[PDB]
Design a protein around this ligand. Structure first.
Ligand code: ZR1
Lengths: 301, 621
């Protein structure tokens, strides 16, 4: 009946909290989408602005602008759910079943008109959000696509990573778009750097986070942040951004540009699935977990 | 007409999902017993103490549904061979937990993937579950014809797909299965769920799965082409493979999302309906496929009435015997002597009299006179012969109740006719018998058959190897089942080399120091990489001149049922590389009481000598 496992927390430009969730146990294995105009009233279901029930669990989601929400479904579908004119409803635009297994990762491209999905079917697809079709289908990997992260400013560049131990730098301008960026353990999470469009960070299943420059695939700086897998990495909105890394070790850390630890939060009792920094207060960081918690952190800056 | 199932990775409501699947036409659903993404922790706090239920309840379905309709699926995050110590430890506990939950439910099958070269700890944890408690479920190893790493799109700029042939490299998924089942000690509860891709591999890659325990064949929706009308269809190469799997009676599984306006199931049913109809041999053997039987010993034992009934209902073999006598009667008696010469015709091992009735029809069409004798040692069959001698044959046939080697005949014979052959020709001791009948044969008399030859071909079949392994009995040598031939309608197997002649006997043998013992060395060129488990034996016989009978597959006498191939197993299976020669040695041995075979492989590796001194198997004289 209800979805206890919170999968995604996403703050839009004004400061309204987005909430993706799934029931990964019990009689029903369905999912839900929630909007909270009052972030402190989360995850209380009756203290929300809008909500919707989905037929399958929410593995991933992204803000397609300020009204739209792109969803990676267990059913093998990419879904677009847009807020109504009043922002008190969430309605389906498309539910496209083009992937043959759990869609687990999603990222909207720079123009906001294209997006890239990464499924357990090993494929990577590029979508036209307006045309509601798959522009290109890519079987470049050998195992499950763990993470797909679209470039901040380039609409044809993005990073993907997989259980086949590869990190592919994509640029759809080339006839062979993918390119392996080496340097170990399996890549689990990708985060593009906001200022250096040629720098990015990635987390492996051994709790280690590594700082990687596309240019030279050598000298690369890294640190052991967590004890278990690194499920996510999100950079702060600051001009000089802080990196928040979440993990299966039920902890959250905030690190500087030299990877030193500035914050550590053990408030979570289950897996930490998402982190979103406040558009209003840049030292306020929100983390949803599998324990149904929403925990609002005050990062010491 | 086709047992088919639906593979799912998303089941939000169990009975809703099953009802939709059943409406589609699927006889079963393969689904996860725990939520695919619900990763669990067993070692460290606080995720170790995760409250609430761990999966949906068993109450949601009747015990019957859980026993016949649900096929479990191992969670994709469970990786017992991960290079991360914590992931191995965690996936060990999670794997036993999932396997035990499927046993709790009485699931008829459970799926486990083979997607990497090393599955050593996966095998150890499955082997440990197999040895714990009471379950009996089948384990299905989902392994592809082509590894995903070798079928990827050539789109990685600095890591291109190779465009050269890698013979052994293309058969890598077979070795993933071979190592896995060797590690699990060839468990009868471990079978293959073979995954077919969009583009089929080379034939040799496909042929690596011959003789393998394939219980399911997985067809993903993306392998289906679209026709003019818009429905999913398959390439003519994919259809040939489906026809091969229909012979093995595998369970077809449809996986992945829908990309066509069940249509996939309808196509399978359509293909199944249009397969070539089963011939007389194919309909007779329906049920006997890969079933191990003891070879008959009609000399040592007395054949049951129904055994003779079955041997009689072989029109082809008797029509061939009719003509062999028909051509001999013309050759021995010229038309001028048509009523001056009556030929002494002696059947040796007459049974209930089917050769006696062939000799009557052969005397009518050849228009010659014959004096028939029906020699039979089985006193029970002799009751059948004497009731027919009185009621129908009359003075024509003289029924003699004796063993051909101890019978003192009234007068010498013109033709001796016998059916003393087994699936390996001389394995029923025909040489010994007809030898002891040469004294009562005229100095120019004909023997029908006049010659017979045994043949052998090396085979691969881990299924027949496992079937022989299951023949271990108490109060005997624990490996005696590997040192005796079996009569078997070989079906799930692979013939590694063309049959070659082994031992030949000719009758009469007017040479002294005759000796029926033999020693033959065969050299079998092998063109594929494989695993040898034994040798199929067949035979050929010359009844008279061009009239012949054969069970050698290439020259098989059409529509003949009296014989199925023999199988001579070997204790330890032998790896054979492409280009290697399998060398086999065979011996026919004897003392005054028994006759037996002994055999050994001398190349590419030696085996022990099988059945030394008939310690495991003899044929009584
Ligand atoms: C030394 C001695 N002296 C007298 N008779 C002897 C022997 C040894 C065996 N026998 C007979 C031979 C006979 O074997 C057959 C009869 C029929 C037919 F009757 F159907 C068959 F089709 C087939 C066989 C055997 N090969 C497969 C087909 C069986 O009756 C035995 O008792």
């Amino acid at each position: 009946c209800m979805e206890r496992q919170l999968e995604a927390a996403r703050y839009r430009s004004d400061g309204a909290l987005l909430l993706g969730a799934s029931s990964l146990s019990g009689r029903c294995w369905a999912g839900s989408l929630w909007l909270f105009k009052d972030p402190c009233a989360a995850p209380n279901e009756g203290f929300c602005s809008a909500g919707v029930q989905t037929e399958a669990g929410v593995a991933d989601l992204t803000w397609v602008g300020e009204r739209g929400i792109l969803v990676a479904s267990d059913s093998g579908a990419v879904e677009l759910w847009e807020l109504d004119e009043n922002e008190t409803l969430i309605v389906s635009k498309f539910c496209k079943y083009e992937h043959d297994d759990i869609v687990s990762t999603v990222s909207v491209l720079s123009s906001g008109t294209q997006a890239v999905s990464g499924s357990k079917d090993i494929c990577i697809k590029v979508w036209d959000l307006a045309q509601q079709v798959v522009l290109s289908s890519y079987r470049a990997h050998a195992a499950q696509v763990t993470c797909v992260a679209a470039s901040p400013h380039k609409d044809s560049v993005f990073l993907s990573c997989s259980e086949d131990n590869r990190i592919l730098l994509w640029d759809t301008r080339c006839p062979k778009p993918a390119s392996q960026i080496g340097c170990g353990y399996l890549p689990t999470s990708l985060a593009w750097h906001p200022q250096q469009s040629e720098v990015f960070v990635f987390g492996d299943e051994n709790g280690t986070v590594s700082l990687v420059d596309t240019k030279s695939t050598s000298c690369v700086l890294s640190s052991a942040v967590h004890s278990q897998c690194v499920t996510g990495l999100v950079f702060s909105p600051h001009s000089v951004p802080f990196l928040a890394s979440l993990s299966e070790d039920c902890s959250l850390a905030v690190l500087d540009s030299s990877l030193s630890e500035l914050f550590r939060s053990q408030a979570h009792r289950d897996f930490v699935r998402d982190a979103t920094w406040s558009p209003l207060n840049h030292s306020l960081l929100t983390t949803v977990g599998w324990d149904h918690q929403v925990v609002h952190h005050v990062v010491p800056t | 007409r086709v047992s088919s199932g639906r593979d799912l990775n998303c089941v939000p409501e169990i009975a809703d999902t099953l009802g939709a699947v059943a409406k589609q036409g699927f006889d079963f659903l393969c689904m996860p017993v725990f939520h695919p993404r619900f990763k669990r922790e067993f070692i460290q706090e606080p995720a170790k103490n995760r409250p609430g239920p761990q999966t949906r309840s068993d109450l949601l379905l009747s015990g019957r549904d859980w026993n016949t309709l649900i096929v479990g699926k191992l969670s994709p995050w469970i990786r017992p061979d991960s290079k991360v110590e914590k992931i191995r430890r965690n996936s060990e506990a999670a794997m036993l937990q999932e396997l035990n939950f499927g046993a709790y439910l009485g699931l008829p099958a459970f799926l486990l993937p083979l997607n990497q070269e090393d599955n050593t700890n996966l095998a150890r944890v499955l082997t440990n579950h197999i040895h714990t408690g009471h379950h009996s479920s089948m384990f299905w190893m989902r392994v592809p014809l082509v590894a995903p790493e070798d079928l990827r799109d050539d789109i990685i700029e600095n890591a291109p797909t190779t465009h050269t042939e890698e013979y052994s490299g293309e058969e890598k998924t077979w070795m993933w299965w071979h190592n896995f089942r060797t590690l699990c000690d060839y468990s009868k509860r471990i079978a293959v769920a073979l995954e077919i891709g969009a583009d089929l591999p080379s034939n040799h890659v496909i042929d690596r799965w011959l003789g393998e325990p394939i219980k399911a064949a997985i067809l993903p929706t993306s392998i289906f082409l679209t026709n003019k009308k818009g429905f999913p269809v398959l390439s003519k190469m994919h259809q040939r493979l489906i026809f091969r799997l229909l012979k093995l009676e595998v369970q077809f599984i449809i996986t992945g999302t829908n990309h066509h306006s069940c249509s996939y199931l309808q196509y399978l049913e359509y293909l199944s309906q249009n397969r070539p109809p089963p011939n007389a041999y194919e309909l007779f053997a329906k049920g006997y496929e890969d079933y191990l039987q003891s070879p008959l010993q009609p000399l040592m034992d007395n054949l049951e009435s129904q055994t003779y009934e079955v041997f009689e209902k072989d029109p082809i073999k008797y029509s061939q015997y009719q003509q062999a006598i028909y051509k001999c009667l013309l050759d021995r008696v010229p038309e001028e002597e048509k009523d001056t010469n009556v030929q002494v015709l002696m059947v040796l091992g007459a049974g209930r009299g089917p050769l006696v009735n062939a000799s009557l029809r052969a005397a009518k069409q050849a228009d010659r006179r014959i004096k028939l004798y029906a020699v039979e040692k089985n006193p029970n069959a002799v009751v059948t012969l004497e009731n027919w001698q009185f009621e129908e044959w009359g003075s024509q046939v003289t029924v003699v109740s004796s063993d051909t080697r101890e019978w003192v005949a009234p007068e010498k014979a013109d033709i001796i006719v016998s059916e003393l052959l087994g699936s390996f020709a001389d394995n029923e001791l025909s040489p010994e018998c007809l030898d002891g009948a040469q004294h009562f044969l005229k100095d120019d008399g004909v023997s029908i058959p006049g010659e017979y030859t045994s043949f052998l071909a090396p085979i691969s079949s881990s299924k027949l190897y496992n079937e022989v392994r299951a023949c271990r009995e108490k109060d005997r040598d624990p490996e005696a089942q590997f040192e005796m031939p079996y009569v078997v309608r070989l079906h799930n197997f692979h013939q590694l080399s063309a049959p070659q002649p082994c031992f030949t006997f000719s009758h009469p043998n007017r040479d002294p120091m005759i000796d029926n013992n033999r020693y033959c060395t065969l050299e079998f060129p092998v063109e594929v990489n494989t695993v040898l488990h034994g040798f199929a034996g067949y035979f050929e016989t010359v009844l008279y001149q061009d009239i012949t009978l054969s069970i050698r597959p290439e020259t098989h006498s059409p529509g003949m049922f009296s014989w199925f191939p023999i199988l001579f197993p070997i204790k330890q299976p032998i790896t054979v590389r492409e280009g290697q020669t399998i060398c086999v040695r065979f011996w026919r041995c004897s003392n005054s009481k028994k006759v037996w075979y002994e055999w050994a492989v001398t190349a590419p590796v030696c085996s022990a000598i099988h059945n030394p001194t008939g310690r495991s198997y003899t044929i009584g004289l």
